[PDB]
């Protein structure tokens, strides 16, 4: 390909990209809820 098609190919590659869905904020939210339940239930 030439320069124009290569630039449009990398533009379409950066535009339509599949990210890595790593459930980190739900893990931390479950940990936060568990810590709140432990702090509520036990002194």
């Amino acid at each position: 390909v030439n320069k124009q098609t290569q630039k449009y190919r990398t533009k379409l590659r950066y535009r339509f990209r599949q990210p890595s869905v790593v459930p980190l904020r739900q893990t931390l939210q479950q940990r936060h809820n568990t810590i709140l339940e432990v702090l509520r239930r036990r002194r």
Binding site: Q18, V22, T27
Partner: protein, 203 residues
């Protein structure tokens, strides 16, 4: 009776030190949860959604009955039994039988779990002779494997991978799952040695 003995030890300890400590409650939580009745109820609620007239469901029924009897005898460990159970559940024949029982409307799964409780009473698959009916009541009135429309607990380990792919959004598309060590800041105590799970947060 070791559970009543541990309850007696818990009462004597809580009367001795005059507070509810962490050691004694952990001890009686470990004693009251040593039973393998959970996996037997898994196998029997998988047997309940089957068809007593179909020969394929008779094969699945006898396979799961032998599996539950081998678990209750202690001759087979829990992990290989879970492998056998999830291999029997993920088959398309069992899923097609469960779909037919859903499409029926007058399903025979309630009589199935009732006869399952009677079998667990008769064959000695429980700890108390009348605990299977309370466990049946617990399976009915709560969210459990008995209220699932296919007859297994709804985790993604008991569902097929080709159905797991278009629904869930996992790490990469198109086994034991781990966090790769490129994340130097994931959480406070999260790291590469912390495993992740597709359809549940066990934390």
């Amino acid at each position: 009776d070791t559970e009543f003995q541990a309850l007696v030890e818990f009462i004597e300890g809580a009367s001795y030190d005059q507070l509810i400590s962490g050691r004694r409650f952990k001890k009686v939580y470990d004693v009251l949860s040593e039973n393998d009745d959970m996996f037997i109820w898994l196998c029997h609620t998988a047997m309940s959604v089957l068809n007593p007239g179909d020969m394929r469901s008779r094969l699945i029924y006898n396979h799961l009955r032998i599996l539950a009897e081998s678990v209750a005898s202690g001759e087979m460990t829990q992990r290989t039994a879970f492998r056998f159970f999830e291999s029997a559940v993920r088959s398309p024949a069992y899923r097609e039988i469960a779909k037919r029982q859903l499409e029926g409307g007058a399903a025979t799964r309630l009589a199935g779990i009732s006869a399952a409780a009677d079998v667990m009473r008769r064959m000695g698959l429980t700890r108390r002779p009348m605990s299977s009916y309370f466990e049946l009541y617990q399976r009915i009135v709560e969210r459990s494997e008995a209220m699932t429309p296919w007859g297994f607990p709804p985790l993604f380990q008991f569902e097929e991978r080709l159905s797991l792919e278009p629904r869930l959004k996992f790490f990469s598309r198109a086994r034991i799952f781990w966090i790769p060590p490129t994340w130097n800041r994931a959480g406070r105590f999260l790291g590469p040695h912390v495993t992740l799970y597709p359809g549940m947060t066990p934390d």
